[PDB]
Amino acid sequence: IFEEAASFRSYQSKLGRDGRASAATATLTTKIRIFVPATNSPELRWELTLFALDVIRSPSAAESMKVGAAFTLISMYSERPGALIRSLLNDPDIEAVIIDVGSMVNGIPVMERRGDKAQEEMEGLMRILKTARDSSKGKTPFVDSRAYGLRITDMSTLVSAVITIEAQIWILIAKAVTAPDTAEESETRRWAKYVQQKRVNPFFALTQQWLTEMRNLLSQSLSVRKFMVEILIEVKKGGSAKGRAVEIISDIGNYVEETGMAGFFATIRFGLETRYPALALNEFQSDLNTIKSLMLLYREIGPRAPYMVLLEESIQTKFAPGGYPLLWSFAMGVATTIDRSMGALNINRGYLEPMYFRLGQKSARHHAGGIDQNMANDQVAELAAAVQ
Amino acid sequence: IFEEAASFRSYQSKLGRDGRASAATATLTTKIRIFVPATNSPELRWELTLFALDVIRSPSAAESMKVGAAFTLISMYSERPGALIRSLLNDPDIEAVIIDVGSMVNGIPVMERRGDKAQEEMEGLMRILKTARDSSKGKTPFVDSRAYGLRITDMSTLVSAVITIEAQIWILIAKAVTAPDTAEESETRRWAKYVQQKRVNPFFALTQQWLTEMRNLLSQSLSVRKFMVEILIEVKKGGSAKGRAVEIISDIGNYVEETGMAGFFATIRFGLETRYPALALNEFQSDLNTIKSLMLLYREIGPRAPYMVLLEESIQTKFAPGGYPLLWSFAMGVATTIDRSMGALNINRGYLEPMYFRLGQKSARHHAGGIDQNMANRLGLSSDQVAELAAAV
Amino acid sequence: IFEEAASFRSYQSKLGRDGRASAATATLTTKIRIFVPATNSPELRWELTLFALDVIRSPSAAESMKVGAAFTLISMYSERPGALIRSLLNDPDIEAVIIDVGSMVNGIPVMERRGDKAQEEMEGLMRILKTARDSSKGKTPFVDSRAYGLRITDMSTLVSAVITIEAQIWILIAKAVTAPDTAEESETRRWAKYVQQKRVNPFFALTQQWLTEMRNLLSQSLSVRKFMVEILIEVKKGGSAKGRAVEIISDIGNYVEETGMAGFFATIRFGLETRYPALALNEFQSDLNTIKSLMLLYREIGPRAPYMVLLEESIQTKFAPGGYPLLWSFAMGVATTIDRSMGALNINRGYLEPMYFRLGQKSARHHAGGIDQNMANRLGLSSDQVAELA
RNA sequence: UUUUUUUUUUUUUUUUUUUUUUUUUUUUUUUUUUUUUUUUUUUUUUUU
């Protein structure tokens, strides 16, 4: 009877989700040059990393080069850097041309072995490096000068350094695409952790100016974020020992997950998991039916789910908290009142519902020790008064 | 209805844990030299141990050599030292070259395996040893100098000594990777135990100077800790004999378990097992869900669990002190009030909720143990003495 | 709900107990020489016992020799002494080479089995014996010197004496590895019993000096204690008749069981079994959950259980009383108050919490000795008078 | 015939304690002793 209606709401939500989109929708693939370390021989590997860091640091380099550079910077981990990119990278927007870096023995620029027209390319590289130095007023990518110069000849030093720079990229990702302004506080907080825990060697700190410029580039460019999120999903999967490098990535993942899906999680954390007396109110019923549909939907979206927001995934829109407004307004009202540090994150959206905002606030604090009825039941007063 | 939400929180927590991880995640492996006991003949075993002690003492050895040295030092236990390392040690960041020492013919150091195209191998060693002596102002590994010169000749003395030094490595692990500063009081307290119980042989006691240098080495090297945790898991398993060597390790283990997962166990010990009427609080329902999801998660992570922190294991993040809600403040508020040993611990965490941390204190201290209250279990005959207990409180 | 948490605590406690340990963990073996009785005729048996008493008494003997001597000393029981050692001895740190010495006509030492590659074996023995005499200032194994001299010629005298010496080894075990100082009072208390009961033959009484030297050897050698505990377990098994020999072992056992697991037993006896009205007190509920996990764990450890501490068996650490602090501090507070003989144990340990201990004391004492909650009903109508008397 | 709104914004490495310490045997009492059986009473009587 009424069961039909509820099932119909769910039917609408899932209708036309299935099947496969017609191939004509596939957009014109954009060609990018991606340098990959040609072997794990430290002289080439260090120089190639420095080249790539400088490409990203340059005021003069074009976006097509800069994406390719960012991909080099966050593939330094691999035993076979080019294989790692090619094998994980699964994105219709971008078509990579992979250059196995090799002997970086053409001075400051990366090696290029095609011949006479590549002599222009090496001089493009030279211009890029010069302009990088000059435009930054002598500050290189790293904060402490000696480190920028320091030639590495052994695997041990190499991995110490590479892991350190990579971790400094992955520091960013967590906030680059949820709000890359306001970003510094959080990214410093995460940096402090990795250094204090001795996972990252602080001599290799990369300069705030460069990191901000790169964070913005990551926010604005999809192709880079696609590769990052591909790797972030792949190494999050369990059932294997890792190298210190992939381990640091995976560890950072536990900050990166759910990020920029705030609303979805806010209704889950506050209101739903809270299981407040408010939930009995008639107004909520429609919203509860909605959330049921949402939870089953979330399941169906599957492996990309922890990073829906970072991937700009459209299905993300369905999960967005604005979708269930009564419960969300109550979920803000509880959260802001009850959980001391939260609620400083700005939930002042236009669709916030005054009744629920006041009722949510009133719910926790107005009742004391669970209000009308404690969840899982003499001495439920004085102590309760002091607590809230 | 509501059951779906709880199951969904659990779903999120386990999502993507499944399958087998894509091969491209393989990290660049670091090539590292492990000298390993070639035969169990006392003069070579003592000399190799002195080499290794000095590698760790040296200002002049590189960290790549020092990790490999630490692996030699804490493999001295074995009947076949090199086999023990090679067969248990299974962590991808490090790729071992194993060199079986032929009782170290040359002098202080290891002998050149095939004869030295460059005999400077032993000189790199000589420099390492000299720099070690010189930088340490002559101070030898042991607290009593006679030990430093011993030149041991018999199995019995050798095992007495090796067991003693190994135990002195394993004393460190317990704190090296949870708080390598503030360590001294605890690590001395554990040393005193093993000596007083006559398990560990005090003639061979190792100097605070040596122990600090090695504690630092442990903190700063992952590769070493990986081998240590591999062995620590392996010997924790039952179903055999234990020899004095493995027994000392296993004994150390009972201090080492759970360590630096403070927050996780604290919610279990304080708040949960405490069974305070306080669970009934509104905020509590969610927090209970988190623990259930967490507890079932912990189970599923399995073998690594007792040492998550030390192994840098990511899932550890979920177990993290910060995330647990009401307990992260309420479980501490109770714990600090009720358990005299607790609270000496540093509880500076940003996740603590002040109001809820005092409610936990109040819940216990309400009657000085909730006297004339609580006592949920009613298996007890009599109702009278609740009041008496409250008066005692 | 809450049930999950309790089950999880239990899961942690049993996690990783399972499986069979990888072979690399096998510890570097010590080679020890054990002289055993090659024959059943006293002439040899008395002389070999004197040799062995002196090996243990020696200031100049190596620890490797001393362990092997102790194994000779506490295998004199057997009809086939070598078989008894070889067949029960099952500990990985130590590998025995056993040569059953017949002649023993050398003097103080044995007679070298196949003849010695060096006659210096016999001279090593001579050094051992000389150093033993000299270092002891001539005070011999026995308390009355005639016994030390007495050459033994008959089975009857032999068994009387061997039983006597063996019992003097087994009196030590009970305290050597729990409290090897403070020892004398207890070991003498047990000696008095065996002699007064005429089970062990006082003609063979062994000197305080000898007994302290052997007690110290037991404390400082693990390999010895392993063999002792192995024998102590093996002969404790029922379904056999026992002769004077096995009977003295089994008798010693009644002091030896539970020993050095003090804390575990005390919480069971005092506080827990006592079922004081305070069990329900919320403060202890997890403690109680803890102890339950402990008890079920203890069961699971099985065969070694009555001697875990003496075996240095790891799992023992978990069982150690510091582990359940609230319950323990209260189990002591009660125990000290209620049981007149207890409390003579030094419990000045870090786990004891004054407030909870004072609760144990007052709750028991002001309770009028656990009158706080009595469990007994159906005996009949309650005596108010009796309650007041208590 | 139909008419509204709908991206995001917080926090998240950690820090305690944890070897043990008692007392353990035995002691009292142990057979029996009393009593016996039987004995009394026991047809009927009015009226129709």
Numbering used by the authors:
A (entry chain I): 4 to 380, 387 to 397
B (entry chain J): 4 to 396
C (entry chain K): 4 to 393
Can you provide the manuscript's text about this entry?
The NiV RNA genome is encapsidated by the nucleoprotein (N), forming a long helical nucleocapsid assembly. This assembly not only safeguards the viral genome from degradation, but also serves as a template for productive transcription of mRNA and replication of the nascent viral RNA genome by the viral RNA dependent RNA polymerase (RdRp). Each N protein monomer is comprised of two main globular N-terminal and C-terminal Ncore (Nucleocapsid core) domains, with each domain flanked by the N-terminal arm (NT-arm, residues 1–31) and the C-terminal arm (CT-arm, residues 373–398) subdomains. The structure shows that the nucleic acid lies within the charged cleft of the N protein at the interface between the N-terminal Ncore and the C-terminal Ncore domains.
